Amino acid sequence: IDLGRVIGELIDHRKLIISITSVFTLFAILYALLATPIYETDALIQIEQSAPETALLQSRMILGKTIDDLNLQIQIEQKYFPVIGRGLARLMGEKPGNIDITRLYLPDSDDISNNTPSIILTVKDKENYSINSDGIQLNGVVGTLLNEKGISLLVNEIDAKPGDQFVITQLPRLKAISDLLKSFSVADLGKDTGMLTLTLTGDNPKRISHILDSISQNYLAQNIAIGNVRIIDNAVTDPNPVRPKKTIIIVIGVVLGLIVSVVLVLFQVFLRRGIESPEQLEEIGINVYASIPISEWDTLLAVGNPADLAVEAIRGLRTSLHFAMMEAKNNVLMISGASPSAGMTFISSNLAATIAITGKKVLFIDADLRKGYAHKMFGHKNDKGLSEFLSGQAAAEMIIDKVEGGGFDYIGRGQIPPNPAELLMHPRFEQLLNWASQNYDLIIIDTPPILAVTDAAIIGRYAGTCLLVARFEKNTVKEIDVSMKRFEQSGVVVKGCILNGVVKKASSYYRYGHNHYGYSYYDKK
Amino acid sequence: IDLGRVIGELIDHRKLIISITSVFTLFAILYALLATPIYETDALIQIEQSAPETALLQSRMILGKTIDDLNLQIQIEQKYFPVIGRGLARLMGEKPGNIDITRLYLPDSDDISNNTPSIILTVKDKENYSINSDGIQLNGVVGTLLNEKGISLLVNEIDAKPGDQFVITQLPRLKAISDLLKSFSVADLGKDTGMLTLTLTGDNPKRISHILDSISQNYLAQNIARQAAQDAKSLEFLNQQLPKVRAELDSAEDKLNAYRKLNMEAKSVLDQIVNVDNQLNELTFREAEVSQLYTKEHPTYKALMEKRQTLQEEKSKLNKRVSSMPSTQQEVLRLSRDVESGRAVYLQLLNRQQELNIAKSSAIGNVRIIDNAVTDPNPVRPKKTIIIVIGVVLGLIVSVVLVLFQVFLRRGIESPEQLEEIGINVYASIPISEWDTLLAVGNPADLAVEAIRGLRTSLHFAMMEAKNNVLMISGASPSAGMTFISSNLAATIAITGKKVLFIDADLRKGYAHKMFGHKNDKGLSEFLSGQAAAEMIIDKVEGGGFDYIGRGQIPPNPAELLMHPRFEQLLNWASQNYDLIIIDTPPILAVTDAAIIGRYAGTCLLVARFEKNTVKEIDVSMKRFEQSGVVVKGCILNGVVKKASSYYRYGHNHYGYSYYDKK
Amino acid sequence: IDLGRVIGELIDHRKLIISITSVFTLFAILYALLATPIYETDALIQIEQSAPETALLQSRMILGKTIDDLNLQIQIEQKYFPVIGRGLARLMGEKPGNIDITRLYLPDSDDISNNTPSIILTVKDKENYSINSDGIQLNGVVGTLLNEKGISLLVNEIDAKPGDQFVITQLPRLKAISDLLKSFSVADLGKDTGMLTLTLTGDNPKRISHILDSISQNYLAQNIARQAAQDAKSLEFLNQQLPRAVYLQLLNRQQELNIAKSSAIGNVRIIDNAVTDPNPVRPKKTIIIVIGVVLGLIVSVVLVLFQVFLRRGIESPEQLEEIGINVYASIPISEWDTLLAVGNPADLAVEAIRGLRTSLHFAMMEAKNNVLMISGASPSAGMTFISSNLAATIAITGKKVLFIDADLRKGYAHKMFGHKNDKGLSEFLSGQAAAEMIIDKVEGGGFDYIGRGQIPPNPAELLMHPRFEQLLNWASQNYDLIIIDTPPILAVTDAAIIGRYAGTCLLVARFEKNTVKEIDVSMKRFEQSGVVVKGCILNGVVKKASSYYRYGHNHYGYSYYDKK
């Protein structure tokens, strides 16, 4: 692999790379916007040490006293149904509602697992509200305390709009202490100075500053009730959130999308075996006679769009065949796919059309007695196709039908017989070929793939020329070689191959200095 | 790839390299010349340790005093419309105008995000000015304070030319402290030494030294008041006053609760008066401290009573506004004023007690300011020289990687050597002519015409021992110069006294008829489709000497017209009247017409384009011709350009010398 | 590459190498002898610490007191127009004049263009002088102060010659402190020890020692003042506390504090006062010259290496013979309108052409006819020099030689031999001249020549006329050898047309200018047109040691005569 191969592969998969990278960046931006901003407050404390002050500041004594003072065991969360509701609600601009609760006793359900009782409060106005723990509806009022259903609850100053729901949890005191301890940090900036820097993170900037001030003053009061701790700086909140770090999140999104795109591209590059250029077949010693491009398009393409790029390639194939087919036993050309859906009847029918327009009589036999659909494609008197002639119940003149937008006669397969391979072994097939080799200038035979069924091997003994049809990416070089060796093993010589369905690729161009797709050539008018 | 290869590539792509490098250095130069200069000031403080003092100097407590005295919450920015207007105005010598604001209080929106209210002040003269917060136009005069629409402002000593605009922000005290702290630095410099090296950076050299002087003197006066605080009565005074103020606050809170158990203008004037009361109380305490540690005739004390008189006038106006509003909201406003002023005084006295307690128990005695703050007039940023150097180096690296990519990603033919390696005979390398008449006729002394004459002499030797005198010339891709080559070759072989017929068998995009002047009726199409004879389709080129057959009208079936026996009849007839027939044919990788025609031509030549075709393309064309029974004699490389990379990779550039007597 | 190759390359390029190194060294000596010498003074301070005293010495307080004492805000520079006038004036022995200014007050415009005001003082005699700020001339005298135009100046002791100019700048005190601090350096020789080394650099050896003594004395006075301030504060408190045993005790304490206050000498000791080192510390001339020499050598070697690796021209006949191109001669450079073979028959290039003639006699037998077409690869390859001199050397041997100049585009053999320029080869080809009107006699020659004639508009198509072949067939029986001169084949096609009629064809390759691939391309382009080039003549060979060490031979040839 070289630089040109790498860049060509990247250019080919530029849609996949761009899509995957943009999906990753979209997810990163969606996270950075919808992630709740977590703020930071800090306070400065002077010690006259600082090793035991840290362990006493984070003790459950100070922290629990702070929680008791500020009633931090009453958790209130405005209710948004998804994991994205809070973020987008902040993004639009709706101010998040808060209700001040000072006295809360839930019935202490204290079941096997859920140690934290929780209710949902629904705001009905600025004045009254409703409560539902487990569907039990209660109606309450700001001011007047509520003592009903094992519920004691005191709301002051509801600040929200009606319809808002709030999950209100009475979490245990140690859970609250652990929650405070998780976001509270004590450090010493100088490592030798008496100063301690207290830090608290949280989503509500005012609440965390109040909490850190309370921590500072609880520590101060504990010391005084003596070695003079003094509060240098009270807690103030940085208004810029410290998390989420939007820029690094987006950058990691972009970089990770690039890495995933690149690794998928290399997996696809090293895991594809199909044909990529005619050079791959010509290395094996196989003569490629045309590389037919993809046509973006029941009429024949060589008729509904004679100026199409694929029809031009097929004309090139016709001129190759006029030279390859001389010094052949007869005017019979057997076209065989390598695999099903190799685009082989497309090629044979359009080749019949382009050879017919040159003033030659062409007969298109559809000897795919298993899945042949030429009759469907050309319109049809479906009775008396090839099977009926082979099984003895038709004459040669009764099975030939003329294509309207054609110029070539054709013979349909007929009814799908139960024994397609054994009808073709009848001498009537060779009699039909010998008869048609006098009334027609060219006979093109449609055959099933040789790696599926043996029918093509039987038919190809009576064919002067035999051409395989490969699909551009679907068929492998080894499939073509296996097909030609299986033809040889049965006494049939494949003259060469027709690569079909070629698409424009930069990897081809850089790997093999030609892409093999072909130029468009007309004066635009 | 060797040294000569790389040198040749650099020489060839010198234009791209120079342009990219010059663009990068231009960007670096304009950045270094337009970025705002950042000056640095430094002081030297002597300490009688010093790590607690380094951490206490950078505390919000010490810095907040500097924001309070120097009004650092009033941000004034001279308004330049672009991101570069300030720098280019500095370059043109326009002195940055400045205005002095001693009192600014905005309507204090406090929305979700914009915590910093902003207004725009336009200068009209040396005396009056205009203001527009949110489109509301106001007219103010320096001196006389302005109280309008919940906006209090006092602008003094305006020193800008008329028409100058300024963005005035009242950024919050904590934001002011953060901005100050981000640019402030304190270092002991010895670890034992009492020597503290304070530094401060900023874009105004006169202002940062005032800030650093304020910081140094704040810390100095703090440590001095530490010595006199031990015996001072202020401690006991605060210890007695704080319970009284707390009791008054509790009484006010109880009264507010009893009365409770939202007019826009009422709340706005309440906020105005609360702010005025905070400023007045803080100014009273600052006046006391200054009168203790400074003199009355000191300029600071003069600023103090001037600001006090200003605040008193503002409070009087606010009280007059209150007296005009109905008593129903007046009662609520008075209760709110009492509660908020009690809270403010309680907080201020708590801060006073905190500062006094911190001052008292400081082990450090005499502190002395050795070097007052002085600003280095050479900006510390931008570092112009390194900026321009990085610009040059970055431009060079970018140019080198672009050139390396374009060298490793190119596949087009670089010399006839590439073709002749594959066993393809090149018969001429036609150069690019900088120049509707034929080049071989308009400029018979051209360089490309000389190459084409060489091609003529090479063809006379190639075309001997051929089947006939028919020469088919086919491109490899469109726009390979195939018709240029064939037409000028007909022009050169014509002047040698030979009868040349130029058939244009490109029935798809043939334009030789337009290029030679057209009796376009009865072209090759009409003859092929049977509606014309040979004698009526041959025309004569005026500046030529060779006859030509045009394509005619574009048929719907060019490849099927060309297979007619009429084409071979025409060629067999013309091969007896003419010494040479040259046929213009479409490319073989586009259509198959050339493959059909080449069966009737005794010699066939492909025209490759210099950089636009690949060697693999030429080989694919020759093999596609061979597969149809046409044998391509060789190739004509076309459009060659002079390249040093050819001269170092191969020994020859294949471009060709110019040879005439210069006159 | 090997040792022999690089040695030969340096030997060949010795002129470039020596010239580049010489230019670099002249730059080095010019810089070393014109850069202003910088002297360094040193003083020794001992502390009985050492970390804060270093920062105190370099503080704006001590330095500012020094500048106020010595008036360092007045900067005086002798005026020389170039960046080299001062250096050359020092070289010529001109003692630098100085003026002593004790009081200066400039108008202090302090505008954006000029922050520090400046005037120019022109010395007219030992006493009087003139001043111009921005063109306004004012006359002053030593002694009598000048107070005019918002300018006050007191100049004392002018020591200079008349016509000397001095740029006098008034520096802001902070700028003077910045300048002083830049050159002043405090160090601790022990890194812990109380010993402090003070150094100061500058272009005036006496001034820097005065400044460093001022700094040291200000620092010492400040240090002893600190001990005296505490002692005087204690004494002042005792005196203010004076109201009988306590009275006598306080009197004794007052006397003790007086004696301790006056005994100032304390923490700082000035061991060495500043003295200037007479040898300037900068510019370090010898190392500068060494760097200049080495840099010139490196630059020369790099340029030589680039020229060696980027040259593609022919360097020996063996390069051509590697492909299989027969080289029949290598013609050296002749150091030299008459022919070389006639003006200087004993030249080295003419001897090489004689060797070529004897080689050609063998090469040209079994050829179709006696026609020899000589073509170049490039113009200016020496085609006509070789052709004409070869014709001369073959004509002195008593053979009929016809020299045809078939270069119809830039042929100048007629201008070389002297010309009856009418009826050249073009005129014969154009149909308007006979064969016999175009042949002319070379005067100092011995061979006939046919000039090209008037430059035709179609040189390549005239040569295609059968008249040309008729002329060759006719001349092939009236002459023993026809030498035809053509344009180069990589320029035009005329040589390929003419080579159809020549029995022998030879390419002339210029020694350094042409490339081996160029000669191969030329021969293959000849073959493609049915013309077989017998071989090559390398021309313009020069003597090179790189060839002698790379190849076993230089291919330039010996001179061979008996010197008398």
Short mmCIF file of C-alpha atoms in Angstrom, two decimals, chain C residues 309-534:
data_model
loop_
_atom_site.label_atom_id
_atom_site.label_comp_id
_atom_site.label_asym_id
_atom_site.label_seq_id
_atom_site.Cartn_x
_atom_site.Cartn_y
_atom_site.Cartn_z
CA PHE C 309 24.97 16.86 -6.93
CA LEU C 310 22.87 19.13 -9.16
CA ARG C 311 25.10 19.11 -12.25
CA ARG C 312 23.97 16.75 -15.01
CA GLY C 313 26.23 17.86 -17.85
CA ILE C 314 28.78 15.65 -19.53
CA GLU C 315 31.97 15.28 -17.50
CA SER C 316 33.99 12.69 -19.44
CA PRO C 317 33.71 10.86 -22.76
CA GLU C 318 33.32 7.72 -20.68
CA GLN C 319 29.85 8.86 -19.62
CA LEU C 320 28.77 8.83 -23.26
CA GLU C 321 30.64 5.59 -23.93
CA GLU C 322 28.74 3.89 -21.08
CA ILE C 323 25.62 3.91 -23.27
CA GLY C 324 27.59 2.88 -26.33
CA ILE C 325 28.16 6.21 -28.09
CA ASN C 326 31.42 6.36 -30.02
CA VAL C 327 33.37 9.49 -29.11
CA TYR C 328 35.85 10.20 -31.89
CA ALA C 329 37.45 13.23 -30.24
CA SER C 330 37.43 15.36 -27.11
CA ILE C 331 38.29 18.89 -28.17
CA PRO C 332 39.71 21.07 -25.36
CA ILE C 333 38.98 24.73 -24.74
CA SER C 334 41.13 26.92 -26.93
CA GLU C 335 42.28 29.89 -24.86
CA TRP C 336 41.93 31.98 -28.03
CA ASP C 337 38.11 36.00 -37.60
CA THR C 338 40.71 33.63 -39.01
CA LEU C 339 40.49 29.93 -38.26
CA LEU C 340 42.20 28.46 -35.22
CA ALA C 341 43.68 25.78 -37.47
CA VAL C 342 45.33 28.59 -39.46
CA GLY C 343 46.05 31.33 -36.93
CA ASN C 344 47.40 28.88 -34.34
CA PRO C 345 48.20 25.56 -36.05
CA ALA C 346 50.07 24.41 -32.93
CA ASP C 347 47.10 24.85 -30.61
CA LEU C 348 45.96 22.03 -28.34
CA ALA C 349 42.45 22.12 -29.80
CA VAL C 350 43.86 21.91 -33.33
CA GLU C 351 45.95 18.91 -32.28
CA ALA C 352 42.79 17.29 -30.93
CA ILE C 353 41.05 18.04 -34.23
CA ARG C 354 43.95 16.39 -36.08
CA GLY C 355 43.47 13.29 -33.97
CA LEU C 356 39.80 13.53 -34.89
CA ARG C 357 40.76 13.75 -38.57
CA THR C 358 42.80 10.56 -38.38
CA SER C 359 39.97 8.83 -36.51
CA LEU C 360 37.50 10.04 -39.14
CA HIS C 361 39.58 8.68 -42.00
CA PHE C 362 39.03 5.24 -40.49
CA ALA C 363 35.39 5.84 -39.52
CA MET C 364 34.36 7.14 -42.95
CA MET C 365 35.63 4.25 -45.07
CA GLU C 366 32.91 1.77 -46.04
CA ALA C 367 30.47 4.70 -46.05
CA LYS C 368 28.01 5.28 -48.88
CA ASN C 369 29.62 8.54 -50.01
CA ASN C 370 32.20 11.12 -48.94
CA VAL C 371 29.58 13.30 -47.24
CA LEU C 372 30.01 14.08 -43.54
CA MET C 373 27.11 15.82 -41.82
CA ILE C 374 27.92 17.32 -38.43
CA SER C 375 25.01 18.14 -36.13
CA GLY C 376 24.82 19.36 -32.59
CA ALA C 377 22.55 18.50 -29.73
CA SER C 378 22.31 22.10 -28.47
CA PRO C 379 23.15 25.46 -30.00
CA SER C 380 26.47 26.91 -28.88
CA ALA C 381 27.87 23.36 -28.77
CA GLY C 382 30.76 24.42 -31.01
CA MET C 383 29.52 22.83 -34.22
CA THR C 384 30.99 25.31 -36.66
CA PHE C 385 34.27 25.73 -34.80
CA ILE C 386 34.85 21.98 -35.09
CA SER C 387 33.50 21.74 -38.64
CA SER C 388 35.59 24.60 -40.03
CA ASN C 389 38.78 23.58 -38.27
CA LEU C 390 38.31 19.95 -39.29
CA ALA C 391 37.88 21.08 -42.89
CA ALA C 392 41.07 23.13 -42.56
CA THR C 393 43.09 20.23 -41.14
CA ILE C 394 41.79 17.88 -43.85
CA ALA C 395 42.49 20.50 -46.52
CA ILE C 396 46.12 21.03 -45.52
CA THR C 397 46.64 17.32 -46.18
CA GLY C 398 46.02 18.07 -49.86
CA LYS C 399 42.41 16.93 -50.22
CA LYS C 400 39.54 18.75 -51.89
CA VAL C 401 37.19 19.76 -49.07
CA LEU C 402 33.79 21.42 -49.53
CA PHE C 403 32.28 22.95 -46.40
CA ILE C 404 28.53 23.51 -46.76
CA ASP C 405 26.80 25.62 -44.11
CA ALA C 406 23.33 24.08 -44.14
CA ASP C 407 22.34 25.94 -40.96
CA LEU C 408 19.95 28.24 -42.81
CA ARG C 409 18.69 29.84 -39.58
CA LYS C 410 21.78 30.98 -37.66
CA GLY C 411 24.67 29.99 -39.93
CA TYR C 412 27.57 32.43 -39.69
CA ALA C 413 30.42 30.65 -41.49
CA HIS C 414 30.16 33.32 -44.19
CA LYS C 415 30.64 36.05 -41.58
CA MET C 416 33.57 34.02 -40.24
CA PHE C 417 35.45 33.36 -43.49
CA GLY C 418 34.66 36.72 -45.05
CA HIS C 419 31.86 36.56 -47.56
CA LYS C 420 30.58 37.28 -51.00
CA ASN C 421 27.34 36.62 -49.17
CA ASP C 422 25.16 36.82 -52.27
CA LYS C 423 24.16 33.45 -53.73
CA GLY C 424 24.45 31.22 -50.68
CA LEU C 425 22.91 27.80 -50.18
CA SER C 426 19.37 29.13 -49.74
CA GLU C 427 19.52 30.97 -53.06
CA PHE C 428 20.62 27.79 -54.81
CA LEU C 429 17.81 25.93 -53.07
CA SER C 430 15.29 28.71 -53.76
CA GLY C 431 15.86 28.12 -57.48
CA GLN C 432 17.58 31.47 -58.14
CA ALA C 433 21.26 30.46 -58.21
CA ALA C 434 23.50 27.92 -59.91
CA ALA C 435 25.80 25.47 -58.18
CA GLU C 436 28.95 27.28 -59.31
CA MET C 437 27.93 30.75 -58.11
CA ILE C 438 27.69 29.68 -54.46
CA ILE C 439 31.08 27.98 -53.95
CA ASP C 440 33.71 30.33 -52.53
CA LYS C 441 37.39 30.06 -51.63
CA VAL C 442 38.55 30.44 -48.04
CA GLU C 443 41.55 32.76 -48.07
CA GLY C 444 43.67 31.27 -45.29
CA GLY C 445 41.84 28.01 -45.81
CA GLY C 446 42.37 25.55 -48.62
CA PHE C 447 38.80 24.28 -48.74
CA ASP C 448 35.73 25.55 -50.55
CA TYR C 449 32.75 26.78 -48.57
CA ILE C 450 29.09 27.31 -49.44
CA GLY C 451 27.43 29.92 -47.28
CA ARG C 452 23.83 29.60 -46.21
CA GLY C 453 22.87 32.87 -47.90
CA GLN C 454 19.83 34.93 -47.02
CA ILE C 455 17.80 33.39 -44.20
CA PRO C 456 14.76 31.78 -45.85
CA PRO C 457 11.29 31.78 -44.30
CA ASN C 458 11.11 27.98 -44.80
CA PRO C 459 14.54 26.49 -44.05
CA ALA C 460 13.22 22.98 -43.47
CA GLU C 461 11.26 22.88 -46.73
CA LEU C 462 14.07 24.28 -48.87
CA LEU C 463 16.36 21.49 -47.69
CA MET C 464 13.72 19.00 -48.83
CA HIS C 465 14.05 20.18 -52.42
CA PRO C 466 15.77 17.65 -54.72
CA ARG C 467 18.13 20.50 -55.62
CA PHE C 468 19.99 19.84 -52.36
CA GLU C 469 20.57 16.18 -53.19
CA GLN C 470 21.58 17.15 -56.72
CA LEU C 471 24.15 19.54 -55.25
CA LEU C 472 25.47 16.82 -52.97
CA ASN C 473 25.66 14.30 -55.82
CA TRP C 474 27.46 16.84 -58.00
CA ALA C 475 29.91 17.90 -55.29
CA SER C 476 30.63 14.28 -54.32
CA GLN C 477 32.57 13.92 -57.59
CA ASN C 478 34.36 17.29 -57.55
CA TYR C 479 35.62 16.91 -53.97
CA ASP C 480 37.23 14.36 -51.67
CA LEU C 481 35.10 15.29 -48.64
CA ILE C 482 31.98 17.37 -48.04
CA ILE C 483 31.46 18.59 -44.47
CA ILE C 484 27.92 19.84 -43.85
CA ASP C 485 27.00 22.02 -40.88
CA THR C 486 23.41 21.78 -39.65
CA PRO C 487 21.29 23.18 -36.83
CA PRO C 488 20.87 21.03 -33.71
CA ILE C 489 18.36 18.20 -33.94
CA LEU C 490 16.60 18.98 -30.66
CA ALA C 491 15.82 22.47 -31.96
CA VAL C 492 14.65 21.80 -35.53
CA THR C 493 14.41 18.93 -38.00
CA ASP C 494 16.77 20.20 -40.71
CA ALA C 495 19.68 17.97 -39.69
CA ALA C 496 17.42 14.92 -39.94
CA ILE C 497 16.46 15.96 -43.48
CA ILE C 498 20.09 16.46 -44.50
CA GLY C 499 21.30 13.23 -42.89
CA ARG C 500 19.42 11.19 -45.48
CA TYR C 501 22.17 12.15 -47.94
CA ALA C 502 25.28 12.03 -45.74
CA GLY C 503 27.28 8.83 -45.54
CA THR C 504 28.61 9.75 -42.10
CA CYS C 505 26.95 11.81 -39.36
CA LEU C 506 28.58 13.06 -36.16
CA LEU C 507 27.07 14.81 -33.15
CA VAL C 508 29.04 17.52 -31.37
CA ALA C 509 28.38 17.47 -27.63
CA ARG C 510 29.45 20.48 -25.61
CA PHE C 511 31.46 19.35 -22.60
CA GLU C 512 29.61 20.77 -19.59
CA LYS C 513 26.48 22.27 -21.15
CA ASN C 514 24.94 19.16 -22.69
CA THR C 515 23.70 16.06 -20.89
CA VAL C 516 24.21 12.39 -21.64
CA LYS C 517 20.46 11.82 -21.98
CA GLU C 518 20.42 14.83 -24.30
CA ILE C 519 22.90 13.12 -26.63
CA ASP C 520 20.99 9.85 -26.41
CA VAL C 521 17.71 11.62 -27.22
CA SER C 522 19.39 13.33 -30.17
CA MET C 523 20.74 10.08 -31.58
CA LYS C 524 17.43 8.29 -31.11
CA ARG C 525 15.60 11.15 -32.82
CA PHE C 526 18.04 10.79 -35.71
CA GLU C 527 17.43 7.03 -35.92
CA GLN C 528 13.66 7.58 -35.84
CA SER C 529 14.09 9.60 -39.05
CA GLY C 530 16.26 6.97 -40.71
CA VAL C 531 19.61 8.65 -40.04
CA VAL C 532 22.31 6.72 -38.20
CA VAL C 533 24.73 8.84 -36.20
CA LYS C 534 28.15 7.21 -36.39
#
